Amino acid sequence: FNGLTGTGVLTESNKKFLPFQQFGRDIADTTDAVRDPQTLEILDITPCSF
Amino acid sequence: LSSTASALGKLQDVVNQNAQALNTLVKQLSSNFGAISSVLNDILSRLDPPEAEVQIDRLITGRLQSLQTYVTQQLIRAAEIRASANLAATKMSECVLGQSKRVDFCGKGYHLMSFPQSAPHGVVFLHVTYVPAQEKNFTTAPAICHDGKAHFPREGVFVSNGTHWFVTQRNFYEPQIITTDNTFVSGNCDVVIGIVN
Amino acid sequence: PEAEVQIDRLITGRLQSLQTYVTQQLIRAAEIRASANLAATKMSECVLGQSKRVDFCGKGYHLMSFPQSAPHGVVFLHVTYVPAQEKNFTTAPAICHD
Amino acid sequence: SIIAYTMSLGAENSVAYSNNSIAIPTNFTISVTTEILPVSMTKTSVDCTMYICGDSTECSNLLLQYGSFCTQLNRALTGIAVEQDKNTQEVFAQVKQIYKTPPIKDFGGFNFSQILPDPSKPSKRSFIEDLLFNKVTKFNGLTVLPPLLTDEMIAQYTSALLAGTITSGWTFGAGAALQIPFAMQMAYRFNGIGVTQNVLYENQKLIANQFNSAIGKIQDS
Amino acid sequence: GGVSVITPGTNTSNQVAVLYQDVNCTEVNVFQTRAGCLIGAEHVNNSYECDIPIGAGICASYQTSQSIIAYTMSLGAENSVAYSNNSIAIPTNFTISVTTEILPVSMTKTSVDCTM
Amino acid sequence: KFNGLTVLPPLLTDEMIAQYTSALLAGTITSGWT
Ligand SMILES: *[C@@H]1O[C@H](CO)[C@@H](O[C@@H]2O[C@H](CO)[C@@H](O)[C@H](O)[C@H]2NC(C)=O)[C@H](O)[C@H]1NC(C)=O
Ligand SMILES: *[C@@H]1O[C@H](CO)[C@@H](O[C@@H]2O[C@H](CO)[C@@H](O)[C@H](O)[C@H]2NC(C)=O)[C@H](O)[C@H]1NC(C)=O
Numbered sequence: 001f002n003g004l005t006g007t008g009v010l011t012e013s014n015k016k017f018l019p020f021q022q023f024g025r026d027i028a029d030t031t032d033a034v035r036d037p038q039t040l041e042i043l044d045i046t047p048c049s050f
Numbered sequence: 051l052s053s054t055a056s057a058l059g060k061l062q063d064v065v066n067q068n069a070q071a072l073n074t075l076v077k078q079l080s081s082n083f084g085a086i087s088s089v090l091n092d093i094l095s096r097l098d099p100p101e102a103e104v105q106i107d108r109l110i111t112g113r114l115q116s117l118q119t120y121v122t123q124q125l126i127r128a129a130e131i132r133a134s135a136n137l138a139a140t141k142m143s144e145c146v147l148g149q150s151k152r153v154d155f156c157g158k159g160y161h162l163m164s165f166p167q168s169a170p171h172g173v174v175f176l177h178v179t180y181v182p183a184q185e186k187n188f189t190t191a192p193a194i195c196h197d198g199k200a201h202f203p204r205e206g207v208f209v210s211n212g213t214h215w216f217v218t219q220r221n222f223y224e225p226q227i228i229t230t231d232n233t234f235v236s237g238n239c240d241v242v243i244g245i246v247n
Numbered sequence: 248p249e250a251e252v253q254i255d256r257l258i259t260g261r262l263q264s265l266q267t268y269v270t271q272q273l274i275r276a277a278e279i280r281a282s283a284n285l286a287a288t289k290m291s292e293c294v295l296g297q298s299k300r301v302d303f304c305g306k307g308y309h310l311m312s313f314p315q316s317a318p319h320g321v322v323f324l325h326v327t328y329v330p331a332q333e334k335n336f337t338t339a340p341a342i343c344h345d
Numbered sequence: 346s347i348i349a350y351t352m353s354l355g356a357e358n359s360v361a362y363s364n365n366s367i368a369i370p371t372n373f374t375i376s377v378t379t380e381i382l383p384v385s386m387t388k389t390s391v392d393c394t395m396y397i398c399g400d401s402t403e404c405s406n407l408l409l410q411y412g413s414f415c416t417q418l419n420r421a422l423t424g425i426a427v428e429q430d431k432n433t434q435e436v437f438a439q440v441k442q443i444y445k446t447p448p449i450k451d452f453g454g455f456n457f458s459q460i461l462p463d464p465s466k467p468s469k470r471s472f473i474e475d476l477l478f479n480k481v482t483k484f485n486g487l488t489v490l491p492p493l494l495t496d497e498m499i500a501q502y503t504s505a506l507l508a509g510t511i512t513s514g515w516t517f518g519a520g521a522a523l524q525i526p527f528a529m530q531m532a533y534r535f536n537g538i539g540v541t542q543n544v545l546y547e548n549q550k551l552i553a554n555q556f557n558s559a560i561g562k563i564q565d566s
Numbered sequence: 567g568g569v570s571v572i573t574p575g576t577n578t579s580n581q582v583a584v585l586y587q588d589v590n591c592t593e594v595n596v597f598q599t600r601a602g603c604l605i606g607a608e609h610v611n612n613s614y615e616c617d618i619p620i621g622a623g624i625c626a627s628y629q630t631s632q633s634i635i636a637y638t639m640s641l642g643a644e645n646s647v648a649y650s651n652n653s654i655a656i657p658t659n660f661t662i663s664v665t666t667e668i669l670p671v672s673m674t675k676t677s678v679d680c681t682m
Numbered sequence: 683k684f685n686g687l688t689v690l691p692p693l694l695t696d697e698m699i700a701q702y703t704s705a706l707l708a709g710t711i712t713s714g715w716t
């Protein structure tokens with residue numbers, strides 16, 4: 001998404017995203033959630049269980 | 051316990067210190083460490099692998115230094131926790147398991163017994179203690195001469211209300227008429243200092 | 248740009264100096280804390296009350312403990328019981344009268 | 346000259362163990378033993394930013410890249426300083442109420458003047474305490490923090506514990522201080538170690554002289 | 567001078583006192599302490615139990631309208647034992663009380679994969 | 683969290699800790715110091 005490659009399980013996210021917001025980022029700078037470029041649907045980012 | 055969380059505050063503080071160390075590692079990932087971007091992926095996407103590695107090397111040195119500092123803090127905290135655990139084990143062995151003659155080892159006053167209470171990452175000891183409630187002043191004699199022979203109490207010390215002489219234990223006031231069985235006879239009155247008749 | 252690279256080499260050494268200083272202080276503090284805990288235990292079981300522990304407060308039988316203020320330290324003076332003159336006597340575990 | 350030798354293991358004494366013989370002391374002596382423990386280390390606070398950067402904006406920008414690395418070290422140093430104050434407070438403050446010895450020294454002749462703080466000195470500290478203090482002897486962001494408890498306070502805390510031991514015996518540690526004659530308190534100490542109380546009263550003059558001599562020897566040492 | 571902020575709980579009060587370490591008040595409610603110049607605290611002759619430790623025998627509490635104040639911390643009530651050569655005190659009555667001591671046996675276990 | 687930082691559960695469960703404390707407590711109440 002937006003030139004960033006990450007591996008994680010993809011699920012819809014309950015948290016609302018404002019129109020300006022395209023991504024949700026943790027303090028650690030890891031991207032918790034992203035909004036799809038093709039369609040504006042909020043998706044939670046969950047890393048595959050380890 | 052219900053009114054104040056301060057008593058469990060020290061246990062909470064230890065949990066907070068562990069959480070702070072994890073939070074510090076999260077903050078470190080945000081730090082650039084001299085790299086163009088803090089995120090490893092951002093450097094990899096915009097730079098060739100050989101070029102990206104040099105920026106990674108700078109992030110790795112900072113991250114390794116952060117991990118070493120975090121491990122050192124955890125080891126020092128573990129050593130402090132181990133010392134507290136050793137003290138707790140000593141308290142359980144010499145208070146909960148058996149009465150302690152050590153002074154103030156388990157609470158102010160004379161410890162009788164202790165009760166263990168489960169706590170998160172902690173142990174709580176409740177110790178029953180003996181504390182004087184009411185105290186009175188009585189005239190006292192080191193020794194008493196029945197026939198010019200010094201008498202020293204086998205148990206307790208001489209006390210006098212102001213009319214009669216009694217022998218009672220130091221811990222609690224239980225006046226008893228002085229008897230030859232109660233007080234052993236040793237030495238003579240002249241040798242003893244402050245002796246009364 | 249060039250000055251910052253030289254400053255960065257100094258920063259890495261200076262940050263290392265603070266990290267080494269903090270680690271040494273923490274180890275010294277842990278040793279000091281253990282000594283303080285031992286001092287607190289001695290004050291509670293010796294100055295506050297007589298101790299039945301053997302040699303807990305000085306050689307011989309401890310009677311009382313005295314504390315004197317010292318810079319970053321505590322001093323305990325313990326009155327002890329030591330035999331001065333000793334003599335040998337014949338002894339029996341038990342004696343029979345009747 | 347410097348010499349090389351096997352270190353001695355101490356003088357060797359052979360106990361005369363006997364099935365029918367025991368050794369019981371006919372005479373005893375009273376001695377004072379001195380044990381010194383450092384309660385706290387000097388509190389020092391160092392500013393990592395001042396040490397790392399000599400008032401340089403470029404250095405500060407590089408320090409921002411380090412980020413939390415500078416903050417954790419300063420936080421640890423502040424914690425060490427708080428710990429030293431906590432250790433000092435716990436050891437010195439073991440007495441709920443400050444205690445003062447009576448002006449008349451009716452203690453059976455056992456002098457306690459040299460262990461007691463001196464009023465004439467502007468700071469009230471014992472002569473023995475003064476000897477202990479005498480024997481013990483920047484712009485980079487390195488700073489020294491004064492202890493929460495002042496040296497005079499520390500002396501007042503030791504004096505309160507000392508007064509409770511001298512006048513109330515062990516009662517002050519258990520709870521409210523209870524007055525007891527010092528000679529009777531000494532007899533209680535003998536009873537605790539199992540020596541008969543009468544023996545102490547018979548040798549009370551000898552014990553008082555031995556105690557005074559032992560305190561004097563400690564000051565000389 | 568390092569700036570140390572003496573602050574009571576935010577819910578309790580928003581008032582703050584500023585202490586500057588090892589500097590006179592002129593370099594920067596006026597008090598001078600060994601730790602440094604004290605501002606936002608008014609010196610009180612009366613001694614109170616320490617609430618916040620400013621340092622150098624000086625402590626800060628919120629007291630009457632209530633304001634942060636600077637005072638020498640109390641050493642506890644002063645009691646003189648009535649020591650007597652011929653008199654002893656023996657308790658006529660006693661009380662049974664339970665004391666609580668809490669120690670942390672272990673710290674939360676954390677495992678970090680350095681490689682990840 | 684997802685950085686490889688993990689929390690490990692203790693070998694002794696809180697209920698097990700309560701059972702241990704109870705055993706010591708019961709021994710003090712019924713058998714005294716024996
Ligand atoms: C208390 O009793 C003792 C013992 O009877 C008295 O001591 C005696 O005093 C007389 C007169 O000085 C001597 O002759 C005896 O030899 C002493 N006996 C001994 C060895 O104790 C003492 O004087 C009495 N005190 C009072 C105040 O009556
Ligand atoms: C000295 O002790 C005697 C002990 O007999 C006290 O007399 C007793 O006082 C109690 C309380 O008033 C009475 O119940 C007893 O019947 C009294 N006994 C006798 C024999 O009279 C005497 O009061 C005491 N003196 C003081 C100052 O307490």
Ligand SMILES: *[C@@H]1O[C@H](CO)[C@@H](O[C@@H]2O[C@H](CO)[C@@H](O)[C@H](O)[C@H]2NC(C)=O)[C@H](O)[C@H]1NC(C)=O
Pocket residue numbers: 450452453454455456457
């Ligand atoms: C404390 O020490 C002083 C000085 O040694 C003692 O006072 C002496 O007492 C003896 C015996 O009565 C006299 O012979 C000396 O002349 C006294 N010296 C002085 C300077 O007064 C004192 O008795 C001891 N006990 C106390 C009161 O603490």
Ligand SMILES: *[C@@H]1O[C@H](CO)[C@@H](O[C@@H]2O[C@H](CO)[C@@H](O)[C@H](O)[C@H]2NC(C)=O)[C@H](O)[C@H]1NC(C)=O
Pocket residue numbers: 331332372373374551554555558
């Ligand atoms: C028991 O031991 C004590 C202590 O050694 C003896 O007291 C000593 O007596 C000598 C001779 O008068 C003095 O020089 C010492 O200074 C004394 N020491 C102290 C500190 O008291 C005492 O004389 C001995 N008694 C017996 C039975 O011999």
